[PDB]
Ligand binder design. Structure first.
Ligand code: MG
Ligand code: MG
Ligand code: MG
Ligand code: MG
Ligand code: MG
Ligand code: MG
Ligand code: MG
Ligand code: MG
Ligand code: MG
Ligand code: MG
Ligand code: MG
Ligand code: MG
Ligand code: MG
Ligand code: MG
Ligand code: MG
Ligand code: MG
Ligand code: MG
Ligand code: MG
Ligand code: MG
Ligand code: MG
Ligand code: MG
Ligand code: MG
Ligand code: MG
Ligand code: MG
Ligand code: MG
Ligand code: MG
Ligand code: MG
Ligand code: MG
Ligand code: MG
Ligand code: MG
Ligand code: MG
Ligand code: MG
Ligand code: MG
Ligand code: MG
Ligand code: MG
Ligand code: MG
Ligand code: MG
Ligand code: MG
Ligand code: MG
Ligand code: MG
Ligand code: MG
Ligand code: MG
Ligand code: MG
Ligand code: MG
Ligand code: MG
Ligand code: MG
Ligand code: MG
Ligand code: MG
Ligand code: MG
Ligand code: MG
Lengths: 109, 236, 95, 46
RNA sequence: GCUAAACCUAGCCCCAAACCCACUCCACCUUACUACCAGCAACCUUAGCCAAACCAUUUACAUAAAGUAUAGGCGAUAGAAAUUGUGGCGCAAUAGAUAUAGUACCGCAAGGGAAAGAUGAAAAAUUAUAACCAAGCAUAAUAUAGCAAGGACUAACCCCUAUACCUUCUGCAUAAUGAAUUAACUAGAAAUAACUUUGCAAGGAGAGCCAAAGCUAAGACCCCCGAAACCAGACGAGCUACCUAAGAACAGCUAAGAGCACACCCGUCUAUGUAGCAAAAUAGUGGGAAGAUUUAUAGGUAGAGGCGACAAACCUACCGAGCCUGGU
RNA sequence: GACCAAUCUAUCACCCUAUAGAAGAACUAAUGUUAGUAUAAGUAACAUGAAAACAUUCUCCUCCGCAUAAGCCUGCGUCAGAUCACACUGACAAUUAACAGCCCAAUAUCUACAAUCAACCAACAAGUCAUUAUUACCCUCACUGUCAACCCAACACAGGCAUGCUCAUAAGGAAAGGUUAAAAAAAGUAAAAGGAACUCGGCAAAUCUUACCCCGCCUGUUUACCAAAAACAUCACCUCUAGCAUCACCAGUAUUAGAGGCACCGCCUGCCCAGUGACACAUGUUUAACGGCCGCGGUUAACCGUGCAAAGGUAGCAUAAUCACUUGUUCCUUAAAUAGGGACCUGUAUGAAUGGCUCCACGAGGGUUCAGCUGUCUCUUACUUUUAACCAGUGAAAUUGACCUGCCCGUGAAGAGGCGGGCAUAACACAGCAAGACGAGAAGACCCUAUGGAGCUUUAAUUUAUUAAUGCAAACAGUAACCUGCAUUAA
């Protein structure tokens, strides 16, 4: 009997305690006989490259110069990638069957 | 409110159906019948009132045989499984309906009468005059909608053109088509009216609450009424 | 009585007084004796003659009738032909 | 007997009798939640 | 001198003026802050309190016409048109919006609801203003006798006097209610008409209204708290009454809605308690304790109603019909 | 009628004043509200078992304790400071699934012999657990709960709480802050002679118990929270209604259901439709429906003379739970009997399913009693504890106009501590007191006023909003069958 007490998994009964739970993000499902199925495709794979011979460092030196901030826009990217437009003197309009679709967020981060 | 009646079954089955007690409540939740609720658990038994019914790829008369005679907690009249052909079904158990006995289920209305036994079922068009019957149907292919309780018996009076005036146990006549199906003999479980409840324990187990405690004043309707028999209720 | 109305916010006159009385500019209220039209067969001729005559009102009654009316009813009455034209003004008086 | 103890806590019954689903099923709970939001309370319903 | 007393700035009310807000990242109608899979949803004459001393028809949602016509148990009352044309003689923590905030607290639920602070230019000033002002105490306990006060007295007491206040009622200390003081808040808003004084006059007023001395303008007059109780919808069967589904409990002894007796269910009686252990407790004598028995979980029955082995009993401590909201 | 404390406004003021405009303009009281503080009051309530090296040991109790569903969310572990002493304030980190939860692809489709050691014995309340063939399927350990002295009762609350376990032990705890034992009360131990003789009552504590009356079938329930029953309900009987199917009443059918009166079993339910209701029953039925069963004069009365209707109380029981008579008469039960019981109708207002009478078992129901029983008393006493007083700590409420508060006589809005006359009177404190201060808590609940209410009852005054049936209208078929509007009927 508390309104300010935020409802969580440490309050309700066994049913709601095991149903809700913290941000678990369902990775698989159950198969009748309480036999969870770990879908290998849904398990994330941390793509970590090799940090061999890295030049930069997580900290910069104050001796470096200072430059103005200019948020990149679509016009600048178009002006940069302007090779075929000038050669006229390749584009992906429809990307429904593409690997990582742009408009519908299908790629993680 | 949320109230889904247990009565939900399509195909006929032999197994007892899990009965859910009602308690005199409607779909809303309010009481509509006083004196119902709180009893012993029971399992409904799907009964097939329509005696004559040709199975698949069949039509002509068929024969059946009784296997066992059991008790029915839903109604006061006991029942008895009777298998036939390539299927089984439950039907009302008539008096002197021993097990392992063959029963006929005809339909072809013969010219002359037919000395029907106690278990066989024939249409009214082939039954002698003045023969007790039960499980009378209101129309051809309708089903037992009247006589069915234990110890009941309907005596035949006469026939007119293509109908038959039946005499219900309550001295209330009734005329029905002659081509309808019926059953001879009387229902089993005789002497049920003489059943001595003995104690309130059995009455409570049966599932019937007692009457209220209000001392009602007997109005004018509490007098002895000697009304005449109502007119014959026909159905032609 | 209604000292203040609900729509405009002013006084209100009781129409019963206007229908049962008559206003005069001289400051007097004229009325009519009751019973002048019921059970006239049992009344002696003198009683009938006295009942068929107008009567004035008292000071308290006149003030009550005035309070039950507004300034609109105190206006003159220059009717083209009215029998009470020679009564609105009172002449010859010394306290 | 002791009449100072009537409360039998139970999250199930509490959330079933005063739940967002029950408060939005009928317009009564809708108006209740609207009035609560208009009042300015922190918690709208259990 | 302990306890105390004051600071006034954050913010509030009025219109004067424009018509407002609203997705970074995940989450939200299932049990709200829950990544994931086969089924109907909408449009409703508001009632009621109150006044007629009851109460049914009745009672309200720029100026002039006009509070006229008209309607009205023709009584209490209701009542039209044609025509017309960017600051505070405000408030300054009991005031101002309830607000430092719709915060705990009552709570299962609708629903109700307050205060935080005080010197300033430096608190990364040590170090404190000037004590003084109410209510309770210390500095400082009483010394025949009696509404606590007077005439006095060279002197406190000693001398004589007098029956607390307000309201009621013909009548009062009366033993009729009110009262521990202190600081803050707290109870007469105006009307057809009338009286006094200004200005003009058979006219005045900045259309309209009144005129056989009249009108205009100002001044002066109409209290507060207090029920039982109704309407419409929410909130309420987690305790009590009933119903539904699936479970649990009942030693032992004598021997069947059998008998004694554990656990267990209720409490016929004594005693204690009575601001207590408890806004319904503690021991036995008490009836049952394989059955009309008790109970863990969930769902359903909500007031003109539900339920009811009728106790006209219960429906969240007060049910001859629970509380809230708006009429009040 | 004459003045006037405070504020803002327009006017020179300016150690605080004047002229006019405004009132949220001026408190000894409205069991008025907010804040602190007196009053009983340092009075009521209160805890912590003992020794000690603070290692440890000793005394007593236990129906309590273990894990879990319901429920809480870190709530007596460490670190520094705060204090009956601390569970108080800030950081530390716990609690890791194998236990439980998070759960099932489709199509036709089917489970008659319950459990109770289930085999003998069977019974009624008829009962909780199953699958068949085809298609597609092959990746496998993801998430939540895991603590405590803990939940609901405003409190650290003798209170309320289910499941499997030894229920007294391997669990679980300390009734005594320290001294004395004034008075009063309560829980226990015993009592010289009586065992219910104080008492309306055999009402606490002990024996353990014999025979009666009223009522209730017995079990069971009732007014949680003063009345627990002689009331409520029915196993048994009886009255009325219903001829039928798709949400219950019903997946039921006249031996079945619904609405009622009484109380099982035994003897019985005698009479009356003038009046009301229900049946159109061709004019009558229904009283086990609403209700009723009479008077005047006579040899302490049959039978005569009769009047009226429905009969004029039949059987039965009797001083009743039965209007005064009532403490009846009548014989006992004792020393006394308005306590108890054997018979009389004279109960004039008893009397039959609004049920009359007996009876098998029974009653926390209401009243008596024979042989045993206890301090209830005759007449009370001794001991332990609770408890009380003092020494240390904290620490309320009801209440109070101020009190410097005596007594007697008479008065007094009619009972005087404050009044008229007399007696008395040094100062305060503890230890008991309940005669008075018409003592203290509740706008007396008994009586009365309220053109203030609410519950209940209809033949009180009004409207049929609603249900169902009636006559008419449109509405279609016939010839020479659902909605809608207008009035009536019962609810
Ligand atoms: Mg309490
Ligand atoms: Mg009024
Ligand atoms: Mg009125
Ligand atoms: Mg106009
Ligand atoms: Mg304020
Ligand atoms: Mg304020
Ligand atoms: Mg002082
Ligand atoms: Mg004095
Ligand atoms: Mg006064
Ligand atoms: Mg007064
Ligand atoms: Mg008087
Ligand atoms: Mg007094
Ligand atoms: Mg003049
Ligand atoms: Mg419940
Ligand atoms: Mg009950
Ligand atoms: Mg008793
Ligand atoms: Mg007491
Ligand atoms: Mg009993
Ligand atoms: Mg027993
Ligand atoms: Mg037992
Ligand atoms: Mg109410
Ligand atoms: Mg004051
Ligand atoms: Mg008072
Ligand atoms: Mg006061
Ligand atoms: Mg005292
Ligand atoms: Mg102790
Ligand atoms: Mg645990
Ligand atoms: Mg002590
Ligand atoms: Mg002796
Ligand atoms: Mg003795
Ligand atoms: Mg005596
Ligand atoms: Mg005696
Ligand atoms: Mg006695
Ligand atoms: Mg005995
Ligand atoms: Mg009984
Ligand atoms: Mg009571
Ligand atoms: Mg009781
Ligand atoms: Mg009964
Ligand atoms: Mg019965
Ligand atoms: Mg009779
Ligand atoms: Mg008597
Ligand atoms: Mg003490
Ligand atoms: Mg002390
Ligand atoms: Mg008091
Ligand atoms: Mg006196
Ligand atoms: Mg006195
Ligand atoms: Mg008093
Ligand atoms: Mg009074
Ligand atoms: Mg009234
Ligand atoms: Mg009223």
């Amino acid at each position: 009997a508390d309104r300010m007490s935020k409802w969580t998994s440490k309050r309700g009964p066994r049913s709601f305690r095991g149903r809700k739970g913290r941000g678990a993000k369902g990775i698989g499902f159950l198969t009748s006989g309480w036999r969870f199925v770990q879908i290998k495709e849904m398990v994330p794979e941390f793509v970590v490259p090799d940090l061999t011979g890295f030049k930069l460092k997580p900290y910069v030196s104050y001796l470096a110069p200072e430059s103005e901030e200019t948020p990149l826009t679509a016009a600048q990217l178009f002006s940069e990638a302007v090779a075929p437009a000038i050669e006229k003197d390749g584009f992906e309009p429809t990307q429904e069957g593409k690997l990582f679709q742009l408009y519908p967020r299908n790629f993680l981060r | 409110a949320n109230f889904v009646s247990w009565k939900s079954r399509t195909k006929y089955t032999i197994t007892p159906v899990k009965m859910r007690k009602s308690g005199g409540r409607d779909h809303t939740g309010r009481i509509r019948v006083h004196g119902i609720g709180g009893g012993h658990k029971q399992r409904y038994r799907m009964i097939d009132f329509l005696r004559f019914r040709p199975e698949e790829t069949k039509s002509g008369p068929f024969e059946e045989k009784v296997i066992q005679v059991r008790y029915d907690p839903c109604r006061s009249a006991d029942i008895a499984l009777v298998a036939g052909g390539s299927r089984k079904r439950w039907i009302i158990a008539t008096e002197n309906m021993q097990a392992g006995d063959t029963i006929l289920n005809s339909n072809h209305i013969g010219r002359m009468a037919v000395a029907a036994r106690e278990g066989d079922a024939h249409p009214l068009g082939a039954l002698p005059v003045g023969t007790l019957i039960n499980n009378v149907e209101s129309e051809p292919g309708r089903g037992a909608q009247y006589i069915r309780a234990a110890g009941t018996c309907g005596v035949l009076l006469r026939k007119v053109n293509g109908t038959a005036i039946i005499q219900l146990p309550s001295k209330r006549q009734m005329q029905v088509l002659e081509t309808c199906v019926a059953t001879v003999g009387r229902v089993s479980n005789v002497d049920h009216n003489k059943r001595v409840i003995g104690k309130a324990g059995r009455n409570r187990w049966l599932g019937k609450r007692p009457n209220s405690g209000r001392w009602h004043r007997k109005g004018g309707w509490a007098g002895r009424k000697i009304r005449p028999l109502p007119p014959m209720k026909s159905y032609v | 009585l209604t000292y203040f109305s609900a729509r405009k916010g002013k006084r209100k006159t009781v129409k019963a007084v206007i229908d049962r009385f008559l206003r005069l500019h001289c400051g007097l209220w004229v009325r009519r004796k009751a019973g002048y039209k019921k059970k006239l067969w049992k009344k002696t001729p003198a009683r009938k003659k006295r009942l068929r005559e107008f009567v004035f009102c008292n000071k308290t009654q006149s003030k009550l009738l005035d309070k039950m009316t507004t300034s609109f009813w105190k206006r003159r009455n220059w009717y083209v032909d009215d029998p009470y034209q020679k009564y609105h003004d009172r002449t010859n008086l010394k306290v | 007997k002791a009449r100072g103890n009537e409360y039998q806590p139970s999250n199930i019954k509490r959330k079933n009798k005063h739940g967002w689903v029950r408060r939005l099923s009928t317009p009564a709970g809708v108006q209740v939640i609207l009035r609560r939001m208009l009042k300015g309370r922190k918690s709208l319903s259990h």
